[PDB]
Symmetry: none
Subunit: 319 residues, 2 copies
Amino acid sequence: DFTPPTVKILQSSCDGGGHFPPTIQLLCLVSGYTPGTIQITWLEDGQVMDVDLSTASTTQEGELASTQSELTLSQKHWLSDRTYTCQVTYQGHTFEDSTKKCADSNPRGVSAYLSRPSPFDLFIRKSPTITCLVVDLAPSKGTVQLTWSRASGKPVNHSTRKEEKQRNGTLTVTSTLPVGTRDWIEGETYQCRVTHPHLPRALMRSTTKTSGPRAAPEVYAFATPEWPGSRDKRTLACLIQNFMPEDISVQWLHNEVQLPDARHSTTQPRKTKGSGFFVFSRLEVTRAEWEQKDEFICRAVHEAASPSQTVQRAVSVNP
Amino acid sequence: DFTPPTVKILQSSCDGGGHFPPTIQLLCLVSGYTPGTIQITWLEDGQVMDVDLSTASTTQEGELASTQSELTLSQKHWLSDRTYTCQVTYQGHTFEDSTKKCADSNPRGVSAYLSRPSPFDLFIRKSPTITCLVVDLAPSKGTVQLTWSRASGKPVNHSTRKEEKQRNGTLTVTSTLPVGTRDWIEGETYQCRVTHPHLPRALMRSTTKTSGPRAAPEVYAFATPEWPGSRDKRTLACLIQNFMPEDISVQWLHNEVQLPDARHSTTQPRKTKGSGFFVFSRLEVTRAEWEQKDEFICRAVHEAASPSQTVQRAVSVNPG
Ligand SMILES: *[C@@H]1O[C@H](CO)[C@@H](O[C@@H]2O[C@H](CO)[C@@H](O[C@@H]3O[C@H](CO[C@H]4O[C@H](CO[C@@H]5O[C@H](CO)[C@@H](O)[C@H](O)[C@@H]5O)[C@@H](O)[C@H](O[C@H]5O[C@H](CO)[C@@H](O)[C@H](O)[C@@H]5O)[C@@H]4O)[C@@H](O)[C@H](O[C@H]4O[C@H](CO)[C@@H](O)[C@H](O)[C@@H]4O)[C@@H]3O)[C@H](O)[C@H]2NC(C)=O)[C@H](O)[C@H]1NC(C)=O
Ligand SMILES: *[C@@H]1O[C@H](CO)[C@@H](O[C@@H]2O[C@H](CO)[C@@H](O[C@@H]3O[C@H](CO[C@H]4O[C@H](CO[C@H]5O[C@H](CO)[C@@H](O)[C@H](O)[C@@H]5O)[C@@H](O)[C@H](O[C@H]5O[C@H](CO)[C@@H](O)[C@H](O)[C@@H]5O)[C@@H]4O)[C@@H](O)[C@H](O[C@H]4O[C@H](CO)[C@@H](O)[C@H](O)[C@@H]4O)[C@@H]3O)[C@H](O)[C@H]2NC(C)=O)[C@H](O)[C@H]1NC(C)=O
């Protein structure tokens, strides 16, 4: 029934063109907590700021109370990389949160990408995985460090790096940390921190399960009519659509045996003209295969599908 | 008196280290708006986003109303620099506010791209042009000199130029040049050359008819079945494959109208299995549309298609 105070900071957003506002407001929120003596103080690089600079108010609703504090900063100050801490003292105890201008996302043309677990792995193979790919940089001296960490601080299995210099003259490091199935589904957060000796500071990407509403995919499989010239081959295509989140896995099975991934392609999830995503899968098939057993199954693994997180539709070439 | 609403968008703050949260929450605050119904709407790049990913809250306590709507995004999504908008509707005209990832400290440099005649312009309109686009230009001081030329040395037509200031303060200069069909078709190579005092050495991009083998595209138009979940709209799909080279234009024709590009979602050419390239197109049609004329044709334009660089298939949502 007791609800400790929780601290979080919101900030003025950027221009529709990513431009900073003349002034930056930092709104500190201490939402839904068991009413009690509370105080909110702001720190700029570890020091207490003038009371005249932040306006604080608290209100209650029912069994819990909520309070907020707004601080205005000169754009010049916000851009100087000074750190600002919202310090809350609830019932004599201290709760804190900090922020500073967001660092460059693409330092020196460089890019970083951390991805979530594919649905097949998470549900079918039951061996979840997250891959951290860092690209768009040039070879220097010192090596590149990719460490994995969990928000919960809880340990993390042993990852695996594997860079591979590219043609355009850049390097591409890629590590793949394995995650705890349960761990991931519970909403854990896995961050991928990378310190490049050539690059200024540390670049960091964080990943966790989607939160939005779920919606199972609709699966429709079609077989191309015979096309003049190519009589022993046929193409299968299935549209899997109107599903959420966008994360999905597509597999094809023939003769109760699932075929190898290289046997077909699948587009990237793209939104529908309404709610949800759609994907197209294509399987080039052969006469030997359909005269074998004339049924091919387009299977989709999505977290919203039930009972076993999968939905499928079979198709046959002949009528 | 009657107090006019005001939209403001706050966002998740970064780490104490300047790192982003595993997910970014955007909070839209339309405050002061005098009590009364109101419709908040989010837009991801102009596209209206289904309200299945939002939440309206309101407390017109004391007097004037104040409602807020929050939208959440994954780090990736946010990092893709997609621009988000929050639309309020009150007394007719809608009010709004937009936001995007803040521009990194050091802004990039100029990059030039040279497109190629689209199969459509080349074979349907028979009026092909190649475009030269210079992006991320530092305006104010100086101006970019973009000049065309042919490898044959022959004369080039007059091109038209366009200069557009982007919301991120960068500049875009678009020179688009009419080219001869016979000339393009026969291998003429065109070069675009960019210059500017705030530019080290001159830039140069060239373009010429794609080389290699040719293969005519195959076209298949399908229709998803009618079911209780989609009864006043239907999803059409089309698969165009095994064509070479990659260049191809895809449209959906209906009732003698060439639907807007925006109407459909068409993928970019991927290698089949060496057999050539393939593309997938998906179009959502409405009852009104098929009741006007129950026939939608998927057309692909490709140089290798006989006899008029065109191949097409029609599909119907209803038993004729
Ligand atoms: C400030 O804000 C600026 C925007 O407001 C932003 O500028 C953007 O910069 C980037 C790079 O810096 C630019 O990206 C490049 O865009 C090129 C042009 O794309 C468009 O034209 C293409 C060519 O024209 C077609 O030609 C074919 C035949 O060849 C015809 O069939 C067709 O009809 C056209 O004539 C075209 O292919 C593109 O099509 C896309 O859009 C249509 C829309 O419906 C869609 O249907 C298609 O499926 C497709 O998505 C465009 O119309 C492009 O050629 C470049 O491609 C290179 O780079 C990309 C990287 O994404 C890579 O994938 C490619 O393989 C290739 O190497 C590239 O995408 C962008 O155009 C600029 N936007 C502008 C000027 O409006 C600034 O960057 C920003 N500043 C910052 C960083 O803060
Ligand atoms: C110089 O050359 C290098 C050569 O590598 C080149 O590097 C590429 O750089 C681009 C960016 O410019 C990279 O593209 C980005 O890739 C991001 C991640 O994509 C990869 O991972 C996807 C997920 O699978 C991974 O993770 C799971 C989970 O752990 C794991 O199970 C998997 O094993 C795997 O590790 C994967 O889907 C994706 O594969 C693509 O291609 C296949 C082709 O078969 C296709 O089927 C897939 O659907 C997919 O398209 C890939 O392996 C990605 O998140 C990121 O997203 C942004 O860009 C896209 C553009 O399409 C936007 O749509 C989106 O909104 C985001 O903004 C982006 O796609 C690319 O991956 C690098 N290449 C490498 C090494 O993979 C440099 O660009 C060159 N430099 C110069 C000169 O410019």
